[PDB]
Amino acid sequence: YANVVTLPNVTGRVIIVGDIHGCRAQLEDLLRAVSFKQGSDTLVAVGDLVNKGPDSFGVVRLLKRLGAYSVLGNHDAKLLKLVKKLSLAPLAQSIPTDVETYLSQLPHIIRIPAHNVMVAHAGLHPQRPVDRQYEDEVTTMRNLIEKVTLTATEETNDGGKPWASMWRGPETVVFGHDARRGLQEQYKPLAIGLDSRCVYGGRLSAAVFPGGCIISVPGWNG
Ligand SMILES: [Mn+2]
Numbered sequence: 001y002a003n004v005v006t007l008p009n010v011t012g013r014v015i016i017v018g019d020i021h022g023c024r025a026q027l028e029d030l031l032r033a034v035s036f037k038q039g040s041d042t043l044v045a046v047g048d049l050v051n052k053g054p055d056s057f058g059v060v061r062l063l064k065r066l067g068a069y070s071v072l073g074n075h076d077a078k079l080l081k082l083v084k085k086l087s088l089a090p091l092a093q094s095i096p097t098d099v100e101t102y103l104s105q106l107p108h109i110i111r112i113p114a115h116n117v118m119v120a121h122a123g124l125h126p127q128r129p130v131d132r133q134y135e136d137e138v139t140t141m142r143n144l145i146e147k148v149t150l151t152a153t154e155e156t157n158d159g160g161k162p163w164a165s166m167w168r169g170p171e172t173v174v175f176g177h178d179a180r181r182g183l184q185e186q187y188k189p190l191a192i193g194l195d196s197r198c199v200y201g202g203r204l205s206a207a208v209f210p211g212g213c214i215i216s217v218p219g220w221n222g
């Protein structure tokens with residue numbers, strides 16, 4: 001099943017950021033926008049650190065030097081897949097060892113119990129145990145269709161409802177992935193969708209804990 005990492009000792013301030021997609025400049029602005037204090041705050045990404053943006057490599061190296069955490073996104077996953085096969089193609093041919101190593105160690109889910117939060121790239125199946133989730137679902141789901149009784153799907157043309165509307169907690173699940181829907185806040189405090197489309201010219205948003213307040217900055221203009 002999907003790999004889970006638990007951080008019981010993280011009781012300080014926690015910053016969770018949406019899809020970065022190589023928008024390093026934007027990430028720097030967001031860090032200044034929340035007054036990030038290295039050594040004090042803990043940073044956690046929702047995945048999709050690469051592709052589309054101007055600097056995929058810088059994004060990953062910045063997070064590395066900062067000691068930042070991140071779950072695995074589906075673009076990160078597809079890149080690793082393409083690479084192991086000794087526009088992800090151009091990226092696969094140019095990916096350096098360190099970057100590849102950082103991505104290769106990312107879990108699918110991160111639990112931050114002190115703040116009653118759970119991070120996954122796309123979402124969690126509301127009918128499966130946290131430790132018994134599936135990789136394809138946790139990194140690509142957008143919808144849930146009634147048919148153990150719900151089917152998770154990345155497509156939106158087969159009906160169903162947005163997965164987050166079906167989440168019941170008790171944990172607050174923070175995610176990204178679904179740029180088509182933008183920032184999702186109507187399910188607070190049980191869930192928070194942070195993919196505000198930074199790389200598409202929207203915004204780069206973050207959820208701050210304790211509190212669960214959303215702080216964002218302008219996205220990449222292209
Ligand atoms: Mn994405």
Ligand SMILES: [Mn+2]
Pocket residue numbers: 048073074075139177178
């Ligand atoms: Mn994604």
